[PDB]
Ligand binder design. Structure first.
Ligand SMILES: Nc1ncnc2c1ncn2[C@@H]1O[C@H](COP(=O)(O)OP(=O)(O)OP(=O)(O)O)[C@@H](O)[C@H]1O
Lengths: 184, 69, 341, 50
């Protein structure tokens, strides 16, 4: 649920710097734009790339179908919150809420993150939220919020000990050290 | 002011330098008990970090039973 | 006035709390405090010396070990177990089919105390309590008569022989204090249910033995017989099997009244379903005839549990009205429960 | 006497129940990913959860 968007960051960097590539770099990007219904990510690229012709109804019926898919979960929570449980509601909404912000911008994600940080009693979903901050940190090349949650996750992880997520973080700090200049 | 430490009180420590009686060459029969005890005693005592590497918390609990023998 | 500003200087500021050992007709009292200390205290104030009696807690003023005031402090382990309260919302009117059974016990428990005018003028006075029992596992249905009794006067419930024989005794003394404390709270009702003292197999923890168990029970009879106490502390006994208890227990009590719990018939079971489903909402297609016809020898709590599991299953669909298909499918669960092993 | 209590069975360990729980206890110990969790669980029928 990341690499389809990560390769989009790859193609946006592939389109931005060279102005000589006007074919295979826009084609794969539209190939990933017609799917997953990426909405806000392509506006910043629409200003740099061509303005067509027409997008309009093609992506307007998709963002309205995405808002019907959004409002059907938003209409599922208040029927779900009538009943009650432990996390069975608030965790049901957040995953698709961060996917719904995967459609566009940082908003629904940033509210969903501070929402779910007070829900989970374990680091399982917490660090998953952190991974969402890292992938978006690569898309918008924003290193501000990725240095924080990582520092906070290392303390909950090593209290403590881990295998998969630990060796994952070992690669994450390598991606940040290679984003900036750190060789050792 | 507090205890240095440590000047006790009681027991005391040491007293074992002029001892013990004999080395381990005596009992060679078990060999399955020593593999448990050695790994549960001298290995965690020599390298504390090696356990943290692999992510296994070494216990301090050693229980013995069965006599006789 | 001036006495309050006088006697306070004698006891304070510090003072100790000791225990009374024995009293001498010389107004010198021998007190015992932690640890193992004795003395002669003679004070003419705040006493109350006759009501104290040895074995009670008294103050000790540092100079010199004098008792200024009396202290009765409870707390106490046993006093905590009698209250509170319940005063339960349930009544004897929520049960049916035992009208012929209940009439006499309801009368017998309201015979004394309330409605005394026809009791005291007749000069009968049978204050030995009542004895309950029944099959197969009932006796809680007889407790459903104790809830109505909990609505009146004072109630105390002591159940199970584990509370004596779990450890070494000292035997009945735990019960012996229940008698007297209920005398201080008289009138009060003491109910005992499911007496396994002779029906138990393995004692709890390490204690012995089968015959010592019997002797603590026998001393319970002499306590209950009894010589010599007229106080009530009305006592009610109940169990599943009366054959286990020795006939040695019946003459002192209960000699006047003992009841037997019969199995409910079709009309009674219909009443039972009526009373439980009164608050519940059921579908129109649910009929009360086929339900009681399909069931054979079931008490109120069985038809209760099938409704509880019907509503629990209806919570999966989040429906407050239980359909007859859901009701029968749920009924089959407890039906399969009793029929599995 | 069937009255009153809630009936819940405690199940023995199952294959598919062994997979996920295997990963769960394997979360704290450093290991590579060349480990096949499918074949390793079938080799342990019965036994227990502990
Ligand atoms: N005619 C009736 N009307 C209404 N309720 C009834 C009727 N008969 C029995 N009941 C209810 O059914 C229940 C039967 O209790 P039950 O005998 O299952 O208790 P128990 O678990 O056996 O208690 P113990 O384990 O102490 O013997 C009683 O609580 C009573 O309220």
């Amino acid at each position: 649920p990341k690499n389809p968007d990560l390769r989009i960051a790859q193609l946006r960097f592939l389109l931005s710097l060279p102005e000589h590539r006007g074919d295979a770099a826009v084609r794969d990007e539209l190939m990933a734009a017609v799917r997953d219904n990426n909405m806000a990510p392509y506006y910043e690229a629409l200003c740099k790339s061509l303005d067509w012709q027409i997008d309009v109804d093609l992506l307007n019926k998709m963002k309205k179908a995405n808002e019907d898919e959004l409002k059907r979960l938003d209409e599922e929570l208040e029927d779900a919150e009538k009943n009650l449980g432990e996390s069975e509601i608030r965790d049901a909404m957040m995953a698709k809420a961060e996917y719904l912000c995967r459609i566009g911008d940082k908003e629904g994600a940033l509210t969903a993150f501070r929402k779910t940080y007070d829900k989970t009693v374990a680091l399982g979903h917490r660090l998953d939220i952190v991974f969402y901050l890292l992938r978006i940190g690569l898309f918008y090349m924003d290193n501000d919020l990725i240095t924080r949650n990582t520092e906070k996750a290392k303390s909950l992880i090593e209290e403590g000990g881990d295998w998969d997520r630990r060796n994952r973080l070992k690669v994450y700090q390598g991606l940040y050290c290679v984003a900036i200049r750190d060789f050792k | 002011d507090v205890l240095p430490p440590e000047a006790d009180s009681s027991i005391m420590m040491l007293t074992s330098d002029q001892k013990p009686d004999v080395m381990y060459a005596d009992i060679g029969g078990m060999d399955i008990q020593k593999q448990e005890v050695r790994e549960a005693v001298e290995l965690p005592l020599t390298h504390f970090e090696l356990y943290k590497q692999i992510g296994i918390d070494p216990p301090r609990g050693v229980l013995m039973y069965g006599p006789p023998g | 006035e001036e006495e309050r500003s006088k006697v306070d200087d004698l006891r304070g500021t510090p003072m100790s709390v000791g225990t009374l050992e024995e009293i001498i007709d010389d107004n010198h009292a021998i007190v015992s405090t932690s640890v193992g200390s004795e003395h002669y205290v003679s004070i003419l104030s705040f006493v109350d010396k006759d009501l104290l009696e040895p074995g009670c807690s008294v103050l000790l003023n540092h100079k010199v070990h004098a008792v200024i005031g009396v202290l009765m402090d409870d707390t106490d382990p046993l006093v905590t177990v009698m209250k509170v309260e319940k005063a339960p919302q349930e009544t004897y009117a929520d049960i049916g089919g035992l009208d012929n059974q209940i009439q006499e016990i309801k009368e017998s428990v309201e015979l004394p105390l309330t409605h005394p005018e026809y009791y005291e003028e007749m000069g009968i006075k049978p204050p030995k309590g009542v004895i309950l029992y029944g099959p197969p596992g009932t006796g809680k249905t007889l407790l459903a008569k104790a809830v109505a009794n909990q609505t009146s006067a004072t109630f105390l419930r002591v159940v199970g022989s584990e509370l004596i024989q779990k450890y070494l005794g000292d035997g009945p003394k735990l019960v012996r204090e229940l008698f007297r404390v209920a005398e201080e709270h008289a009138p009060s009702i003491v109910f005992i249910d499911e007496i396994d003292a002779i029906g138990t197999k393995r004692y709890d923890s390490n204690s012995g033995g089968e015959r010592e168990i019997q002797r603590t029970m026998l001393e319970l009879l002499n306590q209950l017989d009894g010589f010599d106490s007229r106080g009530d502390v009305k006592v009610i006994m109940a169990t599943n099997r009366i054959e286990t208890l020795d006939p040695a227990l019946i003459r002192p009590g209960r000699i006047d009244r003992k009841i037997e719990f019969p199995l409910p018939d079709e009309k009674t079971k219909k009443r039972i379903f009526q009373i439980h489903t009164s608050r519940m909402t059921l579908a129109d297609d649910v009929t009360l005839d086929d339900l009681i016809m399909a069931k054979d020898d079931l008490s109120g709590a069985d038809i209760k549990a099938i409704c509880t599991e019907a509503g629990l299953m209806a919570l999966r669909e989040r429906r407050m009205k239980v359909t007859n298909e859901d009701f029968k499918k749920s009924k089959e669960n407890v039906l399969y429960k009793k029929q599995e092993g | 006497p069937g009255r009153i209590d809630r009936k819940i069975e405690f199940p023995p360990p199952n294959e598919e129940a062994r997979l996920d729980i295997l990963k769960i206890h394997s979360r704290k110990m450093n290991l590579t990913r060349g480990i096949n969790l499918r074949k390793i669980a079938e080799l342990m029928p019965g036994a227990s959860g502990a």
